[PDB]
Amino acid sequence: KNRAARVRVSKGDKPVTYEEAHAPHYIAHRKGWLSLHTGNLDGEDHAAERTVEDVFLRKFMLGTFPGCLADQLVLKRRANQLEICALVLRQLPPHKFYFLVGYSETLLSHFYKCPVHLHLQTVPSKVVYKYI
Amino acid sequence: TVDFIKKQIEEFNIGKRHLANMMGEDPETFTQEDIDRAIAYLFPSGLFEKRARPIMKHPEEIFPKQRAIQWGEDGRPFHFLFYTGKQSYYSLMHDTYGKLLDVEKHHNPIGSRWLIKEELEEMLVEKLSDQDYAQFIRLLERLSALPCGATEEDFVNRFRRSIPXXXXXXXXXXXXXXXXGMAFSRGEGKRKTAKAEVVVYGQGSGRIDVNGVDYLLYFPVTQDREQLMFPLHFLDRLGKHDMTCAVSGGGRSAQAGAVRLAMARALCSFVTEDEVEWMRQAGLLTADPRVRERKKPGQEGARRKFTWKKR
Amino acid sequence: SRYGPEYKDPQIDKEYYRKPLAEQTEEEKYERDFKKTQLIKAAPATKTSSVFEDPVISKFTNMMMKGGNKVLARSLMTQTLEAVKRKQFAKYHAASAEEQATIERNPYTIFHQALKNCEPVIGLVPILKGGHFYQVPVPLADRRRRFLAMKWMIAECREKKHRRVLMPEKLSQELLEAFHNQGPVIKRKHDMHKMAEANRALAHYRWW
Amino acid sequence: FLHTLNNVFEPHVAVRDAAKMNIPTVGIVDTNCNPALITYPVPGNDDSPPAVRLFCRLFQVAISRAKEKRRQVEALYRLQG
Amino acid sequence: ATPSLRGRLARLGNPRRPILKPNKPLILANHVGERRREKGEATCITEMSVMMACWKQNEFRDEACRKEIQDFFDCASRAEAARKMRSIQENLGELGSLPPKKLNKLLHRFPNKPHV
RNA sequence: UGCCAGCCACCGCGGUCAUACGAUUAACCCAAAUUAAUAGAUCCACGGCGUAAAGAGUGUUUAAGAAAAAAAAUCACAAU
RNA sequence: UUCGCCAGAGUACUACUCGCAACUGCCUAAAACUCAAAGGACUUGGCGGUGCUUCACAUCCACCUAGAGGAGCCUGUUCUA
RNA sequence: GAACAAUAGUAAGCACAAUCAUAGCACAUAAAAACGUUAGGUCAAGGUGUAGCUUAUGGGUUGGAAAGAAAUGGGCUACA
Ligand SMILES: [Mg+2]
Ligand SMILES: [Mg+2]
Ligand SMILES: [Mg+2]
Ligand SMILES: [Mg+2]
Ligand SMILES: [Mg+2]
Ligand SMILES: [Mg+2]
Ligand SMILES: [Mg+2]
Ligand SMILES: [Mg+2]
Ligand SMILES: [Mg+2]
Ligand SMILES: [Mg+2]
Ligand SMILES: [Mg+2]
Ligand SMILES: [Mg+2]
Ligand SMILES: [Mg+2]
Ligand SMILES: [Mg+2]
Ligand SMILES: [Mg+2]
Ligand SMILES: [Mg+2]
Ligand SMILES: [Mg+2]
Ligand SMILES: [Mg+2]
Ligand SMILES: [Mg+2]
Ligand SMILES: [Mg+2]
Ligand SMILES: [Mg+2]
Ligand SMILES: [Mg+2]
Ligand SMILES: [Mg+2]
Ligand SMILES: [Mg+2]
Ligand SMILES: [Mg+2]
Ligand SMILES: [Mg+2]
Ligand SMILES: [Mg+2]
Ligand SMILES: [Mg+2]
Ligand SMILES: [Mg+2]
Ligand SMILES: [Mg+2]
Ligand SMILES: [Mg+2]
Ligand SMILES: [Mg+2]
Ligand SMILES: [Mg+2]
Ligand SMILES: [Mg+2]
Ligand SMILES: [Mg+2]
Ligand SMILES: [Mg+2]
Ligand SMILES: [Mg+2]
Ligand SMILES: [Mg+2]
Ligand SMILES: [Mg+2]
Ligand SMILES: [Mg+2]
Ligand SMILES: [Mg+2]
């Protein structure tokens, strides 16, 4: 029985995000990729760096934006700039949201020594794909 | 849920305009065919399952049909069969049986099939049981069993469908070369890592050339030359035709077989329309579906397994 | 099995196709055949329309092939047919006119004969009863019998030669001796027959 | 109920159930049937087609007359107002 | 006629002493017993024996008797086709009665009543 | 502390995370008494007897009782 | 309407008594002690060297092929060190 | 808690099935395969609840290990 990245069947009441409801064998069939970069294509270099980098930005966004994160965080790399999209729940009063926008962009840009672009799409409640 | 359909169809049209104006087409002749190209170019998802790819479509194809309101605002139900829990089914049944009865008082292989179970389920907007379906179709046989009136025939036509069947080996028109003014036919066989192309000239010396060398030299294995001989010995043309050949990939038997297929394909221009069905039943023109099977991990040979131990 | 059950076998004989016009039920039948839009198998590479193809020789050819060598088995067979041929020519020219009328010079007729003559009529199957295995007399279906003959010839001329002796030669000897019924192969067939005769009582046990 | 039975010759569920739900019940008992849960029985032959037809058309008519009379008294109600 | 059941069974009323002690209650069941598959005997045994005798007298030269042998194979083909035919024969039933499926539907249509 | 030391009227608790042991901490309830022990009062059946404990291997009579009217007809035949 | 019988389970168709053509017998028939049960019927499972039907499609049997167990070596356990 | 000439079952969900992949079909293979079961495997991938260690059950440097009486599992190469 494969336990990989899966969400078990409950008494049937458990709310589930579209992503967490689609099991590993489904990648590239229904589900998409959470990140995008050149590094894994045939002739390409430095895949590892974009992986460490990605991981750290998962943890970073989960920690800078407490309790307000909706679904897993969507990274794109385009021509040396990062485009970080987030689905974010509405909890915070908007001031704090922009505080953290500036905070994040600046901090990251100076950490990875490349320009970062941030996008928050705000959602009233976690989207429910199944059950509920 | 009907308010949703009104709203959705409105926004669908507004978004339709919005699509045309950006995509730069006349909003009038814009089709679904164009809708597809449009989204496909705007939101290019490589994804294997095609339902999970982006869609903008008329809500009717998007959403399932609904069962309408089944009772007035007094609580009182419209249809008299409502309490059967399937009105949709038993209405068809009442009507069908009525048709039958009237037929009995009055009376004193085109590729046509009955609906599937799923199609009657779509027609009545009603879940069905196998038994139920079977019952009904049985009844339609009873209907066909008697003298068929006009409205009787229309009635059973509702539940009629029609299916295509196509069998012919597709016949290439020949090709007359400009150089000698002579006719040739160029076949392509493919077997098992090996493709071959064979040009067959209609007036031969019996000459058969392979990759620029003679066929005896290129197939020192007798078996192969026999395989080659098959189509020509079949059609009794053995000396009559002159073939040029180019084959690549795989090992010798695979090659000889590819040439078999390609040749037998290029030989159906110069043969009679009747001998074609023979070459089919000889199995000459049908590819070999047989290929190597991938090893599986934790096994040996795709089938062969590591020796299993009871203790 | 990359063929679904939808794909029926090819019928490869040419005489069938060229001359239909005198046969009604067969006209009906092959009409049904292609008209059915019947998906039909790509004909095998071993089966050819060659006028020279004897299916029995093919089977026996295969059963001699170790590993994947068609080439080698083909060659050994070819050399066996050849060897018998020349050996029978040698018997012919060294003989008297009467025996010249007698002698078979066709290696093929010699082969079908030497196999017809080596095939057992009955064979044994073990039956478990009350703890013991009894070997009981079973009538056999033809193809199993053919197989038993061929298997026996091959196993016999494989096993018991002295290593300086090539296969095609010994095989030829066994073929020509089995022709005259004096060969060890037939000793084997006979030990089958005898074992069946000794156990004949037990032919009650078998229920099918 | 124009028959009180199921084709397996037990009492039809609907009897137990109507009776269970506080619905009144009017049905034709036959010599084999059990009347006791039925609100208003009519003892009588369920099997012969003249009988079924008769009972049918009668309940039919009672219905029709009730409906007509309803309509009428509604019209009179409308004139009185 | 059906054997009298009066006074047979041990009951409170009965002044007599018991006759039948049923293992299972005497009631017609709804369903019917499923068909009993028949077993086989040894097939062909005769020709087998005759052909044995032949080889015994003839010192086991198969060429000496063609007759016993060909009749033996005649029997083998009659046997095999008898098995194929008894496999497709399932329309047999009782040959004048109905297969136990039919009986069982039919019996569910006019069931037997213990209760009420 | 670790099936050890121990506890319980019944069911039970202790084998490494014990609200049952021993000791704390809070509570509970009685209270010039409180628990433990042992005797009582109380406690079966005007209920049962196919499978649960219980219809005796069988008949007749004594003793003792209970009582409207009908209550000896025949072997479908194998008591002794 | 009567009579006969039953007050947890063992202990116990037993020990002692009484009577009998029995003298390893029959009948009548306890207590110490031990336990918190002992019993009847049922319910789903599981199981069955029960019975019946239907299968096994590399699969039990019959059958086909190629190997393991023997030899050298590689390499992993288990033991001795 | 079923019988379809139907006798108390209805039910969205997750499984199977369906579709995807193996570059067109088809079959085949791949994948998938719930709920539970075996207190099955792994505190040495990592992370943790409970416990222990803290001038050491911590952290470093230098060497040293992996010998065969056998017994056996799987392979490789043979016996021509
Ligand atoms: Mg698995
Ligand atoms: Mg292999
Ligand atoms: Mg009596
Ligand atoms: Mg008695
Ligand atoms: Mg019993
Ligand atoms: Mg101890
Ligand atoms: Mg503790
Ligand atoms: Mg306590
Ligand atoms: Mg305490
Ligand atoms: Mg006091
Ligand atoms: Mg009392
Ligand atoms: Mg009772
Ligand atoms: Mg008792
Ligand atoms: Mg007692
Ligand atoms: Mg008694
Ligand atoms: Mg007495
Ligand atoms: Mg007694
Ligand atoms: Mg008196
Ligand atoms: Mg009285
Ligand atoms: Mg007692
Ligand atoms: Mg006794
Ligand atoms: Mg005694
Ligand atoms: Mg006494
Ligand atoms: Mg096997
Ligand atoms: Mg198995
Ligand atoms: Mg070996
Ligand atoms: Mg070995
Ligand atoms: Mg170790
Ligand atoms: Mg050691
Ligand atoms: Mg596809
Ligand atoms: Mg498939
Ligand atoms: Mg798998
Ligand atoms: Mg699936
Ligand atoms: Mg364990
Ligand atoms: Mg284990
Ligand atoms: Mg750890
Ligand atoms: Mg910890
Ligand atoms: Mg250290
Ligand atoms: Mg070191
Ligand atoms: Mg060994
Ligand atoms: Mg090997």
mmCIF file of N, CA and C (backbone and C1' of nucleotides) in Angstrom, chain B residues 169 185-192 194-200 219 224 227-232 235 243 247 253-268 279-280 282-289, chain C residues 3 40-45, chain H residues 24:
data_model
loop_
_atom_site.group_PDB
_atom_site.id
_atom_site.type_symbol
_atom_site.label_atom_id
_atom_site.label_comp_id
_atom_site.label_asym_id
_atom_site.label_seq_id
_atom_site.Cartn_x
_atom_site.Cartn_y
_atom_site.Cartn_z
ATOM 1 N N UNK B 169 -8.491 -2.711 -47.919
ATOM 2 C CA UNK B 169 -7.114 -2.251 -47.866
ATOM 3 C C UNK B 169 -7.040 -1.069 -48.823
ATOM 4 N N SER B 185 5.205 1.480 -58.067
ATOM 5 C CA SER B 185 4.496 1.699 -56.803
ATOM 6 C C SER B 185 5.456 1.577 -55.616
ATOM 7 N N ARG B 186 5.427 2.552 -54.713
ATOM 8 C CA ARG B 186 6.383 2.583 -53.607
ATOM 9 C C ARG B 186 5.748 2.264 -52.249
ATOM 10 N N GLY B 187 6.085 1.094 -51.702
ATOM 11 C CA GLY B 187 5.594 0.650 -50.405
ATOM 12 C C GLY B 187 6.496 0.907 -49.203
ATOM 13 N N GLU B 188 5.876 1.004 -48.027
ATOM 14 C CA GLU B 188 6.601 1.126 -46.770
ATOM 15 C C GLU B 188 6.079 0.135 -45.756
ATOM 16 N N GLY B 189 6.905 -0.846 -45.423
ATOM 17 C CA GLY B 189 6.623 -1.732 -44.313
ATOM 18 C C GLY B 189 7.362 -1.333 -43.051
ATOM 19 N N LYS B 190 6.796 -1.664 -41.898
ATOM 20 C CA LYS B 190 7.504 -1.456 -40.644
ATOM 21 C C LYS B 190 7.306 -2.620 -39.701
ATOM 22 N N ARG B 191 8.397 -3.288 -39.375
ATOM 23 C CA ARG B 191 8.354 -4.349 -38.392
ATOM 24 C C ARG B 191 9.485 -4.225 -37.383
ATOM 25 N N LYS B 192 9.130 -4.006 -36.115
ATOM 26 C CA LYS B 192 9.998 -4.389 -35.014
ATOM 27 C C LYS B 192 11.383 -3.774 -35.156
ATOM 28 N N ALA B 194 12.581 -2.190 -37.394
ATOM 29 C CA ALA B 194 13.082 -2.163 -38.752
ATOM 30 C C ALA B 194 12.048 -1.634 -39.731
ATOM 31 N N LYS B 195 12.365 -0.538 -40.411
ATOM 32 C CA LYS B 195 11.492 -0.069 -41.485
ATOM 33 C C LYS B 195 12.108 -0.400 -42.836
ATOM 34 N N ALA B 196 11.266 -0.733 -43.805
ATOM 35 C CA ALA B 196 11.743 -0.880 -45.169
ATOM 36 C C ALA B 196 10.855 -0.114 -46.147
ATOM 37 N N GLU B 197 11.475 0.350 -47.230
ATOM 38 C CA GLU B 197 10.777 0.947 -48.367
ATOM 39 C C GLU B 197 11.131 0.166 -49.626
ATOM 40 N N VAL B 198 10.118 -0.138 -50.422
ATOM 41 C CA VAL B 198 10.320 -0.931 -51.613
ATOM 42 C C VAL B 198 9.630 -0.293 -52.804
ATOM 43 N N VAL B 199 10.397 0.118 -53.808
ATOM 44 C CA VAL B 199 9.798 0.599 -55.043
ATOM 45 C C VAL B 199 9.694 -0.576 -56.011
ATOM 46 N N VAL B 200 8.488 -0.844 -56.511
ATOM 47 C CA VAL B 200 8.275 -1.943 -57.457
ATOM 48 C C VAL B 200 7.925 -1.416 -58.847
ATOM 49 N N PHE B 219 20.769 -11.327 -48.064
ATOM 50 C CA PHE B 219 20.024 -12.272 -47.243
ATOM 51 C C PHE B 219 20.586 -13.677 -47.418
ATOM 52 N N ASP B 224 15.138 -16.089 -45.116
ATOM 53 C CA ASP B 224 14.802 -14.724 -45.471
ATOM 54 C C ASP B 224 14.335 -14.614 -46.913
ATOM 55 N N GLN B 227 10.832 -15.801 -47.209
ATOM 56 C CA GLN B 227 9.926 -14.742 -46.776
ATOM 57 C C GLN B 227 9.701 -13.709 -47.883
ATOM 58 N N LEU B 228 10.788 -13.333 -48.545
ATOM 59 C CA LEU B 228 10.714 -12.390 -49.645
ATOM 60 C C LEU B 228 9.877 -12.942 -50.783
ATOM 61 N N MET B 229 10.096 -14.220 -51.066
ATOM 62 C CA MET B 229 9.429 -14.917 -52.152
ATOM 63 C C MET B 229 7.936 -14.998 -51.935
ATOM 64 N N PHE B 230 7.502 -14.875 -50.678
ATOM 65 C CA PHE B 230 6.096 -15.135 -50.371
ATOM 66 C C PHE B 230 5.082 -14.341 -51.219
ATOM 67 N N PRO B 231 5.090 -12.991 -51.163
ATOM 68 C CA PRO B 231 4.043 -12.278 -51.918
ATOM 69 C C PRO B 231 4.059 -12.579 -53.421
ATOM 70 N N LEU B 232 5.255 -12.576 -54.002
ATOM 71 C CA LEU B 232 5.419 -12.767 -55.437
ATOM 72 C C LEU B 232 4.996 -14.170 -55.878
ATOM 73 N N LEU B 235 1.195 -14.223 -55.885
ATOM 74 C CA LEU B 235 0.544 -13.555 -57.013
ATOM 75 C C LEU B 235 1.097 -13.993 -58.392
ATOM 76 N N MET B 243 12.281 -4.806 -58.451
ATOM 77 C CA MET B 243 12.189 -3.997 -57.230
ATOM 78 C C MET B 243 13.505 -3.424 -56.705
ATOM 79 N N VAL B 247 16.252 -0.638 -46.653
ATOM 80 C CA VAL B 247 15.798 -1.105 -45.337
ATOM 81 C C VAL B 247 16.786 -0.794 -44.218
ATOM 82 N N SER B 253 16.133 -11.166 -39.754
ATOM 83 C CA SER B 253 14.783 -11.671 -39.960
ATOM 84 C C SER B 253 13.799 -10.520 -39.939
ATOM 85 N N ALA B 254 14.003 -9.596 -39.007
ATOM 86 C CA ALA B 254 13.170 -8.406 -38.914
ATOM 87 C C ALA B 254 13.179 -7.661 -40.245
ATOM 88 N N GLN B 255 14.361 -7.552 -40.841
ATOM 89 C CA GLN B 255 14.499 -6.855 -42.105
ATOM 90 C C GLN B 255 13.735 -7.576 -43.206
ATOM 91 N N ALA B 256 14.012 -8.862 -43.393
ATOM 92 C CA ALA B 256 13.312 -9.657 -44.398
ATOM 93 C C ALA B 256 11.778 -9.540 -44.267
ATOM 94 N N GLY B 257 11.291 -9.440 -43.029
ATOM 95 C CA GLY B 257 9.862 -9.310 -42.772
ATOM 96 C C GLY B 257 9.329 -7.933 -43.109
ATOM 97 N N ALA B 258 10.120 -6.914 -42.816
ATOM 98 C CA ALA B 258 9.733 -5.573 -43.197
ATOM 99 C C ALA B 258 9.617 -5.498 -44.706
ATOM 100 N N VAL B 259 10.581 -6.077 -45.407
ATOM 101 C CA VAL B 259 10.517 -6.078 -46.857
ATOM 102 C C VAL B 259 9.300 -6.856 -47.318
ATOM 103 N N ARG B 260 8.953 -7.920 -46.599
ATOM 104 C CA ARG B 260 7.733 -8.663 -46.904
ATOM 105 C C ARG B 260 6.525 -7.729 -46.885
ATOM 106 N N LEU B 261 6.317 -7.041 -45.767
ATOM 107 C CA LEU B 261 5.203 -6.098 -45.661
ATOM 108 C C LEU B 261 5.223 -4.995 -46.739
ATOM 109 N N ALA B 262 6.337 -4.277 -46.859
ATOM 110 C CA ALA B 262 6.451 -3.194 -47.836
ATOM 111 C C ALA B 262 6.159 -3.658 -49.254
ATOM 112 N N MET B 263 6.740 -4.795 -49.626
ATOM 113 C CA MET B 263 6.552 -5.364 -50.952
ATOM 114 C C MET B 263 5.106 -5.723 -51.187
ATOM 115 N N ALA B 264 4.532 -6.497 -50.274
ATOM 116 C CA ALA B 264 3.134 -6.893 -50.396
ATOM 117 C C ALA B 264 2.204 -5.679 -50.419
ATOM 118 N N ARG B 265 2.668 -4.553 -49.887
ATOM 119 C CA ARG B 265 1.898 -3.320 -49.971
ATOM 120 C C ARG B 265 2.042 -2.661 -51.339
ATOM 121 N N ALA B 266 3.260 -2.659 -51.868
ATOM 122 C CA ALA B 266 3.528 -2.071 -53.175
ATOM 123 C C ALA B 266 3.052 -2.973 -54.314
ATOM 124 N N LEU B 267 2.584 -4.167 -53.970
ATOM 125 C CA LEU B 267 2.139 -5.128 -54.967
ATOM 126 C C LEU B 267 0.641 -5.079 -55.194
ATOM 127 N N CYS B 268 -0.057 -4.231 -54.455
ATOM 128 C CA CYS B 268 -1.506 -4.176 -54.592
ATOM 129 C C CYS B 268 -1.976 -3.085 -55.560
ATOM 130 N N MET B 279 -4.666 -11.474 -50.173
ATOM 131 C CA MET B 279 -3.445 -11.075 -49.466
ATOM 132 C C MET B 279 -3.745 -10.673 -48.028
ATOM 133 N N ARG B 280 -4.913 -10.077 -47.804
ATOM 134 C CA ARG B 280 -5.357 -9.852 -46.437
ATOM 135 C C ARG B 280 -5.494 -11.184 -45.707
ATOM 136 N N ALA B 282 -4.263 -13.912 -46.342
ATOM 137 C CA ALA B 282 -2.951 -14.531 -46.236
ATOM 138 C C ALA B 282 -2.166 -13.823 -45.146
ATOM 139 N N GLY B 283 -2.634 -12.638 -44.770
ATOM 140 C CA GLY B 283 -2.034 -11.879 -43.687
ATOM 141 C C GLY B 283 -0.767 -11.166 -44.091
ATOM 142 N N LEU B 284 -0.690 -10.777 -45.354
ATOM 143 C CA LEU B 284 0.538 -10.197 -45.879
ATOM 144 C C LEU B 284 0.665 -8.707 -45.584
ATOM 145 N N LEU B 285 -0.470 -8.015 -45.633
ATOM 146 C CA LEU B 285 -0.517 -6.556 -45.555
ATOM 147 C C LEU B 285 -0.708 -6.034 -44.130
ATOM 148 N N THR B 286 -0.943 -6.953 -43.199
ATOM 149 C CA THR B 286 -1.132 -6.580 -41.806
ATOM 150 C C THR B 286 0.202 -6.612 -41.089
ATOM 151 N N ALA B 287 0.468 -5.549 -40.340
ATOM 152 C CA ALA B 287 1.739 -5.387 -39.642
ATOM 153 C C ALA B 287 1.874 -6.456 -38.579
ATOM 154 N N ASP B 288 3.090 -6.665 -38.099
ATOM 155 C CA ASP B 288 3.265 -7.553 -36.975
ATOM 156 C C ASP B 288 3.257 -6.745 -35.691
ATOM 157 N N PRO B 289 2.189 -6.890 -34.892
ATOM 158 C CA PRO B 289 2.055 -6.179 -33.616
ATOM 159 C C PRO B 289 3.072 -6.667 -32.587
ATOM 160 N N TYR C 3 -2.367 -9.673 -30.196
ATOM 161 C CA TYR C 3 -3.600 -9.964 -30.897
ATOM 162 C C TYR C 3 -4.704 -10.178 -29.884
ATOM 163 N N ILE C 40 -7.223 -9.992 -39.200
ATOM 164 C CA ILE C 40 -6.516 -11.243 -39.419
ATOM 165 C C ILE C 40 -5.021 -11.078 -39.200
ATOM 166 N N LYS C 41 -4.428 -12.096 -38.587
ATOM 167 C CA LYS C 41 -3.046 -12.068 -38.140
ATOM 168 C C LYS C 41 -2.026 -11.884 -39.258
ATOM 169 N N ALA C 42 -0.979 -11.105 -38.988
ATOM 170 C CA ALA C 42 0.176 -11.082 -39.879
ATOM 171 C C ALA C 42 0.740 -12.489 -39.913
ATOM 172 N N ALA C 43 0.813 -13.060 -41.104
ATOM 173 C CA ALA C 43 1.292 -14.417 -41.247
ATOM 174 C C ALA C 43 2.723 -14.515 -40.747
ATOM 175 N N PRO C 44 3.036 -15.610 -40.047
ATOM 176 C CA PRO C 44 4.362 -15.856 -39.469
ATOM 177 C C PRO C 44 5.468 -15.876 -40.523
ATOM 178 N N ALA C 45 6.708 -15.745 -40.070
ATOM 179 C CA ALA C 45 7.861 -15.791 -40.962
ATOM 180 C C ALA C 45 8.297 -17.222 -41.334
ATOM 181 P P G H 24 1.464 5.919 -31.767
ATOM 182 O "O5'" G H 24 0.614 7.127 -32.375
ATOM 183 C "C5'" G H 24 -0.344 7.837 -31.596
ATOM 184 C "C4'" G H 24 -1.699 7.843 -32.263
ATOM 185 C "C3'" G H 24 -2.604 6.660 -31.920
ATOM 186 O "O3'" G H 24 -3.382 6.905 -30.752
ATOM 187 C "C1'" G H 24 -2.442 6.885 -34.282
#
